[PDB]
Amino acid sequence: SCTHFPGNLPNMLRDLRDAFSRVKTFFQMKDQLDNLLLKESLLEDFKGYLGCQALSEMIQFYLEEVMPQAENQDPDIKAHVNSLGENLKTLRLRLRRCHRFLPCENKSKAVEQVKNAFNKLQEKGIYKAMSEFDIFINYIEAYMTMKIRN
Amino acid sequence: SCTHFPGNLPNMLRDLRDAFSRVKTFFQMKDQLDNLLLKESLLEDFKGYLGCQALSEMIQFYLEEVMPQAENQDPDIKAHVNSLGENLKTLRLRLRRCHRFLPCENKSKAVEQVKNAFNKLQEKGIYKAMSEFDIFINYIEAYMTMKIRN
Amino acid sequence: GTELPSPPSVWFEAEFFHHILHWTPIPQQSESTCYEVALLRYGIESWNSISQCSQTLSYDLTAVTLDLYHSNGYRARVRAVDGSRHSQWTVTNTRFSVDEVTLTVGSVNLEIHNGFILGKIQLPRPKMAPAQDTYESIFSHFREYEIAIRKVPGQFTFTHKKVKHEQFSLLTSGEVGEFCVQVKPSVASRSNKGMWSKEECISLT
Amino acid sequence: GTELPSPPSVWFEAEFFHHILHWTPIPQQSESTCYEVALLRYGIESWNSISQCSQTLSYDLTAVTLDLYHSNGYRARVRAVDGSRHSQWTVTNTRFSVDEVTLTVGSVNLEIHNGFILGKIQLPRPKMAPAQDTYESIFSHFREYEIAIRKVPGQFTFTHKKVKHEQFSLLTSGEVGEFCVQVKPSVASRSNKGMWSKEECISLT
């Protein structure tokens, strides 16, 4: 569940950092380049209204590209790295389940029930969903006006 | 491109409705049930802060499940229905390319360049991205504080 | 023949708060025969009878659908009644929503100024319309109008202009005479049809 | 042997704005030998020499890293110099960021009230710290403290309490005597280590 986020996160970030220091020296000794990769631009995107999408992508980036390819190269830390990954997923989870921290990863209630209601029809649902396309267009047009007007 | 949306949309919704009326009678004559499927709850989600995600999902729902399975059943309108689909995609496109109408479908600039910069390294990138994990955690922790504090 | 034929078809024909139901008569109907009008509100499986017997081919369903522009529409049906026998119901093919309301204007008064004439498009304000539901309220944005101008001493030709306000102006270049105007409304996002307004001229001289 | 050995290792040891570089000496070094301290700012490929020759095993790098808590950290290196010969550079293994700053408190004064004593945790305000960069400013939230209390006439034992404010209270149940206090700070989201503060007692009697 979610206590619409009071503060359980602090410790989760700490767990993350704690999980990192066990691979810190390794990768930092290993990385002999001095240019910054996570440009402050990333931070400005995070501090931007596309932020959520920025945060989800980067998190996906590490869990899918980076961490996987790293444990790939040197299986020594493959353990400690994977653990940082589990530690990173436990973070994401607690995020997309509360206080508008990761809305850009949350399924929609209505869209689920409406999908269930449909699937529970079949032949009949394929017809009622299409014959309601006008209402659909209407809702979309409503969503839009919530931006071009009050 | 995008003129950060002045008003080119009106006509796009009209094109959509115009595209629909050519299948309206068909599906509406065919659908002999009188219960509402697109419950007003969907509208409230659209009018909710998960709205964007609600709108993207429904649009995906029609283009992937409904319209495909409908043209499936009766290929007569299979043409007119597909056209409403092209007409619906032209709508979505113009939406996720402007005035914060569909941000929940937009890639992030930073996350792209940073991915390009990485891929352009290889062995070296796998190390510099991991040795910067602390900065990462820092940006995330920054993103968070933009919600638990000013 | 032990059965009474059903109305060939039932369809709405509506203007802003002038939602009239129509239907073709059954083949060779007697005068003792009348039609029963029913009404269904989409989203609620419940048919209601508005008129148990109407000796007409139309019925003003306004009063029972005043919350149309704030709904998902209706469904109507009609069956013939003669004596104790009646027909199967004939229901409208499409769902009557705001999409089947023919747009129209209330009126268009004009004024003669200088090198031009200016007109204001008075929108329709039907009595049956609950005050909260004005035209500008329902079709909040994208309202447009087609303007047809005709020089009176002259032939039956028209100059067409397009405005995006309920107010406009027309250049009276120089010539005098009279100028007859008629407007057709639309809403740029809706594909509703519109009806040209009643002529409306003004004596420049 | 035509070469001069390099310092076994270089590592930072820092407190809030007390960023000191350390390094072990080269095996059997002469007194004519000194170390040269260099500095790199992450994100800029450019090494700078802070000290061309230091006859020590430490160097206060504060002044040249005052914008640490608003950066991505540094990298330092040291090489030995004797005559005209020097060693390869020995660089810190990790990147010195805010993660390697040992937390500490400025001071903790106490007051005797009633069934309790209350303490205020004065945070560190080093002179070298540019006014905009206060402790509460850098570690804006999640600041916590470990409190160790010791009854003076007594043995060397401690009661441990945990507070989440720079201010706290301790119940003086009844007994008199004296109460010695020491605090250890942390930030719930960071995993930085902390150093227990200097004893700080108060004469209840």
- Across the interface, whether the CB atoms of A35 and D189 are under 8 A apart is answered no
Nearest by CB to residue D94, choosing from A10, A18, A24, is A24
- Across the interface, whether the CB atoms of A28 and D72 are under 8 A apart is answered no
3-state secondary structure of D192: coil
The residues that bridge with C60 in the sheet, in sequence order, are: C20
**Which residue type occupies A115?**
K
Residues 6+ apart with CB under 8 A from B65: A115, A118
Establish whether chain D is in contact with chain A, requiring a minimum of 3 CB pairs below 8 angstroms. Answer: yes
Residues 6+ apart with CB under 8 A from A16: A84, A87, A88, A91, B137
Residue D19 near residue D12, CB atoms below 8 Å: yes
Contacts with D141 from chain B: Cβ below 8 Å: 145, 148-149
Which candidate, C159, C131, C47, places its Cα nearest to that of C92? C47
Q: Are residues D161 and D97 in the same domain?
A: no
Cα of C95 vs its chain's centroid, Å: 16
How is chain A split into domains, by residue range? 1-150
The residues that bridge with C144 in the sheet, in sequence order, are: C186
Residue C177 near residue C151, CB atoms below 8 Å: yes
Q: Are residues D97 and D109 in the same domain?
A: no
Q: What span, in angstroms and rounded, lies between the C-alpha atoms of B130 and D39?
A: 23
Domain CATH number, residue D75: 2.60.40.10
**Which residue type occupies C51?**
S
Residue D172 near residue D179, CB atoms below 8 Å: yes
Q: Which two tokens stand for residue A101?
A: 């921290």
> Which of C45, C70, C102 delimits the end of a domain?
C102
Range of the domain at D121: 103-205
What's the gap in Å between the CA of A61 and the closest CA on chain D?
A: 21
Q: Which two tokens stand for residue B130?
A: 């991991």
- Across the interface, whether the CB atoms of C140 and A149 are under 8 A apart is answered yes
Residue listed under structure tokens 């390869």: D88
Query: Cβ of D141: how many Cβ atoms within 10 Å?
Result: 14
List b or e across C140-152, with b for residues whose CB sees 16 or more CB atoms inside 10 angstroms.
Answer: eebbbbbbbbbbe
Name the domain count of chain D: 2
Nearest by CB to residue D189, choosing from B131, B132, B141, is B141
The residues that bridge with C6 in the sheet, in sequence order, are: none
Q: Are residues C59 and C107 in the same domain?
A: no
> Which of C102, C120, C151 delimits the end of a domain?
C102
For residue C169, CA distances in Å to C136, C144, C164, C172, D205 come to 21, 15, 12, 9, 96
> Which of C49, C70, C102 delimits the end of a domain?
C102
Nearest by CB to residue A135, choosing from C72, C140, C189, is C72
List b or e across B21-31, with b for residues whose CB sees 16 or more CB atoms inside 10 angstroms.
Answer: bebbebbbebb
Chain D residue closest in CA terms to B141:
D189
Contacts with A144 from chain C: Cβ below 8 Å: none
3-state secondary structure chain C: CCCCCCCCCEEEEEECCEEEEEECCCCCCCCCCEEEEEEEECCCCCEEEEEEEECCCEEECHHHHCCCCCCCCEEEEEEEEECCEECCCEECCCCECHHHEEECCCEEEEEECCCEEEEEEECCCCCCCCCCCCHHHHCCCCEEEEEEEEECCCCCCCEEEEECCCEEEEECCCCCCEEEEEEEEEECCCCCCECCCCCCEEECC
Q: Are residues D70 and D113 in the same domain?
A: no
Residue C183 near residue C147, CB atoms below 8 Å: yes
Residue listed under structure tokens 């200097």: D198
Give me the sheet containing D143-151, strands edge to edge: D159-163, D143-151, D178-187, D201-203
Which candidate, D44, D105, D103, D38, places its Cα nearest to that of D71? D44
B77 in contact with chain A, both atoms CB, cutoff 8 A: no
Chain A residue closest in CA terms to D72:
A36
Q: Are residues C92 and C121 in the same domain?
A: no
Residue D35 near residue D78, CB atoms below 8 Å: yes
- Across the interface, whether the CB atoms of B50 and A106 are under 8 A apart is answered yes
Q: What span, in angstroms and rounded, lies between the C-alpha atoms of B30 and A128?
A: 9
Residue C135 near residue C107, CB atoms below 8 Å: no
Among B28, B39, B41, B42, most C C-beta atoms within 10 A, so best to mutate, is B28
Q: What span, in angstroms and rounded, lies between the C-alpha atoms of C201 and A63?
A: 74
- Across the interface, whether the CB atoms of B149 and D141 are under 8 A apart is answered yes
Q: Are residues C88 and C137 in the same domain?
A: no
Burial classification of residue D200, based on how many CB atoms lie within 10 Å of its CB (0-12 exposed, 13-18 middle, 19 or more buried): middle
What single string gives the DSSP state of each residue in D12-28?
A: EEEETTEEEEEEPPPTT
Identify the chains in contact with D, defined as 3+ C-beta pairs within 8 A.
A, B
Q: What span, in angstroms and rounded, lies between the C-alpha atoms of C23 and B41?
A: 35
Q: Are residues D113 and D201 in the same domain?
A: yes
Contacts with D142 from chain A: Cβ below 8 Å: 10
Q: Which of residues 90-149 of C touch B (CB under 8 A)?
A: 93-95, 99, 141-142
Q: What span, in angstroms and rounded, lies between the C-alpha atoms of C25 and C83?
A: 17
What single string gives the DSSP state of each residue in B92-150?
A: HHHHTTSTTTSGGGPPPHHHHHHHHHHHTTTHHHHHHHHTTHHHHHHHHHHHHHHHH--
The residues that bridge with C22 in the sheet, in sequence order, are: C11, C58
Q: Are residues C82 and C160 in the same domain?
A: no
3-state secondary structure of D163: strand
CB pairs under 8 A between B and D: 13
Q: Which CATH architecture has domain A1-150?
A: Up-down Bundle (1.20)
